[model samples]
Target: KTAHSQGIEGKAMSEEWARYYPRQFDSWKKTKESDNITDMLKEKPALVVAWAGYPFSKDYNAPRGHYYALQDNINTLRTGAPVDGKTGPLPSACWTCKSPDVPRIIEQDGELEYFTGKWAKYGDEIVNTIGCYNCHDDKSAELKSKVPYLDRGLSAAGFKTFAESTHQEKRSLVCAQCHVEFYFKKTEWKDDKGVDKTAMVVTLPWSKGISTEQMEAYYDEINFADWTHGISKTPMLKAQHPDWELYKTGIHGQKGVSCADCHMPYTQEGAVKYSDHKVGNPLDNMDKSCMNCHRESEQKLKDIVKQKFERKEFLQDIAFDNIGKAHLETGKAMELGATDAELKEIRTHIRHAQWRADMAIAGHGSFFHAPEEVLRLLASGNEEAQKARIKLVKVLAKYGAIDYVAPDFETKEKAQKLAKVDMEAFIAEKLKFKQTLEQEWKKQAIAKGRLNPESLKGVDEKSSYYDKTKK
Candidate 1:
């Protein structure tokens, strides 16, 4: 039977669909055992100090694949286990980008309620990971996609939705639905009756534009601060990944190179051709990805890419060292009794410097997509970081302090200690929550017929369905 005739409803939960779309399944499965972010922090503890008082410091992990979205979010300490009557650190809005079930929940519950609810409330509902329904209509087989949150965010930012975008633009825009930078806009607004209502809404701070300066200006005007740095006490802006923004400013993007052009390059087997669903490093598939555009030897292209990475890495290291030092020194200045007024300019420098550094490094493919812009941002970050440190020294001297004493951030454990987090207790709590709440969530999902494999069976060839091409 046709997918619709069999009541498949474009859910993408079926093993039949997974078998048919094996490439997509395999691509997602490949990331299951990929590197974890906390493991990296174990080796480089300085980052823990850099993000002190933030959930990222508690736990961070390199994202694997779509299949692990729900599981990974559950396991991460950043989400905080909401076990034994405890609430999670995140809101239900956090799941908006992680699953197809979010839209399902939004359909069942009101959008405002879904956006405002707690993360743990929808644990049973949001069982499925990223899937077809996230980017396609359930009733029709067409490619029209909907991300209401993204659309609202774009509208707030003075940008049009995909309805006005070109076909090439939509390719990247699909990924941009989640990959772009965003923030939770918690504010009061007027309702229909002119009553004041408050909600923590997802917003893209792109009203001015997607440039670093433009976004900073937008945030400054709104007086929005993600968090106050524990050490520097600077109101800081945490930049989310801005891959699409950075790419749009790059040579390839200007030349109309879409994300799918590189990451999902087409492949052929016999008489059939399909876009490779294994979205990842283009360098990994040079023959189809690079050679299609550039006339260069594989080794030469590899060398060129490596050179770009080295350049970005060198500047990134410099910015990291400078910002880390600035954080330490500013904390010292504060300890020396420097007033907030006295530290205003230094704080501004810290805010801007760290933001620029973060902007440069946050985008996963930015170095390759926009090397020049990446370098420029890192250079500016280094300059501002040094400026903050320089002014911090003068302030310290004024307070009768001759030298800055660094904190104990030499190891991850020490950094966690400084941040006042008990790692052992945190892990134990997470384990307990997983064993109790998480297990219960799975059980409930299965009992409700939501997680049953039978629910995934719909179309079969024995039914009234056949491809016209094959016929």
Candidate 2:
């Protein structure tokens, strides 16, 4: 498929040969662009409810390819054209995952200053591609070349001999470089300039542990909530992708397998070999991929992978059902005159159930990638979620609302409507803004002589399929 083919799907371009394969490159590019297109249309009302008071409710998208990193965020309604000297939609720390510009800026102004400004302020400077700086150490060329806070996390976790961990460990670590959940700490937490202040620092909430229950405990212990639910009025927690954290409980992680082992397997071309940088599903190229190590026939391996996924799917349904039940019950409790102290316990149920739901859906490919462990985690999540729901029911009944059925929003639109969101009007305004911005992007490109207007119709916009949203 041409890299820019609008209709192309799931085709990857070999970067080594892209210079000679314009069609393939174009098709791959278009596939990336289409990610946001599809993501925006797939309304996730649950997310809107989860982030009721937050800007995410105004506009939140599932992350797509690295290429659309900036474009997707800017196009969202969240930014609101900046206010009170704020330049963009978020904090400068947001640039950390979007581009190499982060390390570059950090090198020049020091880490604190670089992470200080409003997100929009760095737009002009973050023009570089998401490249080597994101995952490679300039001095050692090591995997998982992450920023300082992560290094601190590794230390806190007591990973003895981390420097001596195998290449396989490095592979998984690389994926974790950006796939874990985190939050920014305020100034009360800081000290001397070099002592690290309680500034807007990025810290993973993994101090207690990574299990769904443990993390929920960590959040509760700290009394942290990303925002309150608009409809449920429950203080909510947002789960970032815990792909590596959850994968650690799987078969591959147990067998010491790394992401690079399958997805970035070494390729040979007669005396010349290199790692496949495509870094996606190993199933997409399983023959030359996993078959290299696993001797099972292709069909057998596929079945093994599928079986793991089936189990995960089964458990996920249970998890989601329990989660929905808990949310509705908690809301009923609040409406029934539950005291703040009593409601706090109800919020804990929501927090734990929500965390499990988040973990169950966090890694899209975990089922196949690490079947046994994935299913095990799902089972654990299901058990916890259901347990929470039952307790919630008792709480609701005590509040004089003994009979309560979960509110069913049959579709995303209906769910948003139930949350009291003006979907049609919100969507119309969003679309108009998108059209205007797209035009502006074209004008900027041409005015700077970086683009040729005469060839605009045929010019392919570069895009890729690596969903950064996993983080």
Candidate 3:
């Protein structure tokens, strides 16, 4: 149908749009080599000990393309193969952010049901990676927030609805659907009204605030913890990516620069103009993205970005080093039979220190988004780590253990051994599960008519499809 008759601003249907606008998809695929916490832990085994009890210590990789979502999840050792009906280590909610199929199932079967089961429960149902519909209205094809949980998260964070937000804010909120920090509320935990919470209801811990300390306080208030350290036996908070929070405090955001302004700048194709969906480094499109604001040379802009990154990295190095030492010392104190009361303050300091460091490190492009804020967080983290180490020293001395010897956590294999994770068996099981379950999922999806190629066929121009648009 004609774009005008169909009430569509664009000249292409949703099916044909991707073919015409491949920039987003192309640029998105370029993130394969991005450094991840897993790689960082390899260099500093202390982090492995710090997260000894967590799935991350077993397996973590840098995020690649959206195309690799399902493959990556299935391959990662964190999921732990759920052969047959056995539940995996991860909950069903883990798939929520990875696929567009999640919204489809959640739409069909209520959100509560979708959020209640184990990871493997929805294996067959969630067959597709993210698609256009996840962030666009089906009928209008307009960019809009589609994740209901995200709306709840923003509300919990004390933000206005997407409808109430400005155009620029909506632009960034779209990315926040999966890019922001979140935690699964425990089933036993009750809300303020005493209503029982679901097992894995994805919730953003921003009710108190979005800052490192604020969210930490909120988790502490609720006594929420991701896991306890295996070595130190301390309850810990795992900070997820908080890019949205970091961006909100930046100069660009303050000046009304949305994420799309840099990552998805406008592009012209003949007579039509639309935002390039290819979201990537702003430096890659400096002419269209940065040059619009900064009139400096490309080299000068690169220098600025490099300087900001280096500054953040310098602070991060100190923060991680201090925290690693703190982790080793805390573990030593625990080995010496330190009481819970004695270790309480030390654990709190470690939690806060790690939270601050993760807050700075986890957020994608946070250094560029908010250099000053990142530096502040890293500085706070370093201070907290030092405090924990000092407290650990006292605890060790109290137990008549002077001169705690640090373990050899200098390599990835050593760290894995220290954390007691069998990498070989874990990888083998994950690979077997992927080979079996992935094929079964495809078969089931096709039988259910959810994987049909016919579904993507464009409507005939003169068909009744165009008539529906008029009404």
Candidate 4:
């Protein structure tokens, strides 16, 4: 909103800042390139497994650049090539996060109508990431746009200061576009014609609070779980990005350094000056990225970030071990004929513990950017995990299982295996499916005559793409 009406006018300028900032902007521009997609797919396979059962598992990708939005969706397994020309892997609401074309389409149609369709139904129409059209109010050129629920969130909290947060806060707020957690709701409304329509509404489950435990309590009150865990057999709560929420608890956030400060620092080149649009890890360029105002030695700052990461890793290792132990104990209690009421409490413990642990580790930036708060979160998680374990031990002792050491699975695969998942077979099936899908995409491209004859290859390392000419 601030940038919309006022613009990034009269901001500070830096030569080094300008040179490095464009990397994000350029990356945004290059997102559509097939080569970028190839590299991303090759690098981040863990992400593929994490989003399993979700449409993201089929075709989800690291945002290499903005250009790849359409291709990313089409190439993803989630969209599923629109079998039978109507049904697909996702809903129309999925595009709400992926493209700027949404506003245009919604303007032409009714808002409820727009939200009530399948993903493949509108895949071709919604082609870009949150971009110029989404942020810019076309008629007035104002930077502010109204999102119904965001306003509702502030109003519900009775927090006026949130709306009046400084420009730095606003910068971070913009990235909250997709970084925050949300839930999809179907609302029934009656129109002027007396016809009823059901609209898919996107809402944040933050009424109880934004902290891990608070949000989980809110979910429990509503009896919500994204899915039952296939491995643990207990219902699981999936933690979304929660970046802004977790980051708010960090030092960088407390010190008022926004994500834009690091990911999209200001830059000036010749007569041109603008915010570099690249959104990624600031560590990639510490000098202009953060050292501009940070004033710390590169090594010192890097070390600080690394320490935060190390602490987070230690916390997660402990938390995951605890969670797996709890799951095993709870399953054992179930086997020993624990009453339904007793099982409910045990499941609740598992749900809340994992939720808290996940939330603590949800924001990748939280570990390094806000170490103290992350440490606090880990402490809270540890306490909850321990409490759950104690309860589980009591429940299991009733069944003559007083002394038992839970399986200590080191890797996710090992943990899954212990939980009764066939890791090797699952991996092979997923890989085979993906390969078949790739071949079909190639055939479709050939049929459309848009297939290029060149091999899908990255450019030479010596090319300008790799050369940092300005620096």
Candidate lDDT values, in order: 0.73, 0.59, 0.72, 0.58
Clashes of each: 1, 18, 1, 12
How well does candidate 1 score on lDDT at residue 310?
92
How far does residue 90 in candidate 2 sit from its true spot (Å)?
3.1
Give me the runs in candidate 4 sitting further than 4 Å from their true place.
Answer: 1-27, 30-89, 139-142, 145-147, 160-166, 190-197, 231-235, 269-272, 402-405, 415-471
Query: Which segments of model 3 are wrong by more than 4 Å?
Result: 1-40, 43-46, 187-198, 452-471
Residues 1-471 of candidate 2: C-alpha lDDT, one tens digit per residue: 333434211111123224544443444344243343333213445544444456655555555555455555555666544422354446777667655556667766767776665765565455433445566544343554556666666665555323556776877776676777777765443334655542366777777766666677787898887767765677777776777777777777778877778866776779976676654446767886788778878888888877776777677766655665566666677777877687666566666666666666666666665566566666666666677677777777787667778777445565555556665565565555445644565566556543334323322242121233422
> What is candidate 4's CA lDDT for residue 383?
71
Error of 4 at 229 (Å): 3.3
Question: Model 1 misses residue 399 by how many Å?
Answer: 1.3
- Highest-lDDT candidate: 1
Identify the superior model by TM-score, candidate 2 or candidate 3: 3
For residues 156-272, write the lDDT of model 1, one tens digit per residue. 667677777777877778888778888987756665567665657777788888888899888889887888887788898888788888898999989998988998788788998
What are the TM-scores, per candidate, against the unseen true structure? 0.87, 0.77, 0.86, 0.74
The better-scoring model by TM-score among 2 and 4 is 2
Question: Tens digit of lDDT per residue, candidate 3, span 1-471?
Answer: 223334422221233344534665455334332212224555545567667889878766555445455545655678888875447788888887776677667777767767776888887677655556567664555677767877787787788878788888899998888888889875554445676756678888888877777888888899888888777677788877788888988999889899889988887789977776655567877998898888879999999899998998889878877776777777887777887888899988888898888888888589999889999999999999999888887788898876876576767788778778787887777767767875687678768755543321221111100122310
Off by over 4 Å in 1: 1-7, 10-38, 84-86, 153-159, 187-198, 269-272, 408-410, 452-471
Better of 3 and 4 by TM-score: 3
The order by descending TM-score is 1, 3, 2, 4
lDDT order of candidates, top first: 1, 3, 2, 4
